[PDB]
């Protein structure tokens, strides 16, 4: 028995069980989203500096 090597991951099994129960939605992980550049501009306190 000391030779035994664990295989797989129990977390994947619990996630598959929660999905088979229907309790949780499943989908590809989302990434950071922004449809626009989010334009930056210098502050007036700095822009007026000479």
């Amino acid at each position: 028995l000391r030779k035994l090597k664990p295989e797989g991951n129990l977390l994947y099994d619990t996630v598959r069980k929660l999905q088979s129960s229907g309790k949780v939605e499943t989908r590809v992980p989302v990434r950071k989203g922004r449809k626009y550049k989010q334009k930056i501009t210098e502050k007036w306190t700095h822009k007026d500096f000479k």
Partner: protein
Amino acid sequence: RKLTRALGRGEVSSAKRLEENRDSYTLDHIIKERYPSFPDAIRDIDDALNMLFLFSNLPSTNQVSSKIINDAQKICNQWLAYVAKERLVRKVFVSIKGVYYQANIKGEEVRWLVPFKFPENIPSDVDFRIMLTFLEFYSTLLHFVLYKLYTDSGLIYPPKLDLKKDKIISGLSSYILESRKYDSPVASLFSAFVFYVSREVPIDILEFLILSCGGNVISEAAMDQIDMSKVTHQIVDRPVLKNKVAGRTYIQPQWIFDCINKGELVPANKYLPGEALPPHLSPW
């Protein structure tokens, strides 16, 4: 937002006073409304023990803070000590994914899996936050269940523990039970026996079974820090065991598993190293 204001104003003492003046939300009302007829709550217990035994084994990491892992290990040790004191175990099934378990609970069956105590990688692809919320719900549910099971038996809860025992092996010996026949046969199996175990065999998964059967257990790992005057058996799995005492019996760890699966106390001549064990003779 109030803590953010207290931190941005520089009055850290006000932030400490605000942190002291708050309490976490309790789910117990949800546990009551969701599971009337407490045995019906036992019907869903299988997912709770599984998720808790899973989270207890994974290494501490970000989004865990390890406090949840500590509460899970505590609840698992308490449930194991209760199953051992009540000798509720009835079947076992070792597997590559872990050591499966089964035990009666007021006559209801309750299967559960115990992950092997080895490091495991985190894929990070799963939504960990939902697993943490499910773990919190299952923790509140199993906490209420263990409280009811302890009050029904009259044992004090939460059980007291000797801190020195936690510093040695942190095993099932922690959280000793005490009050404020046996199932015949599966309970009190190996009665009066005092087993010994080699270091290579697992100590937690095996000691819990021999203790739930009522047999005494000792491990060489306890000798690393610190009698063997009463041992009647010595589990061993080394490819070439060191010269055994003629008066002491020796057997492979597998012998306990089939003996629990059957309860017939199969002869010791089988499972003697290095002889190959029967594959599993699994109950299911």
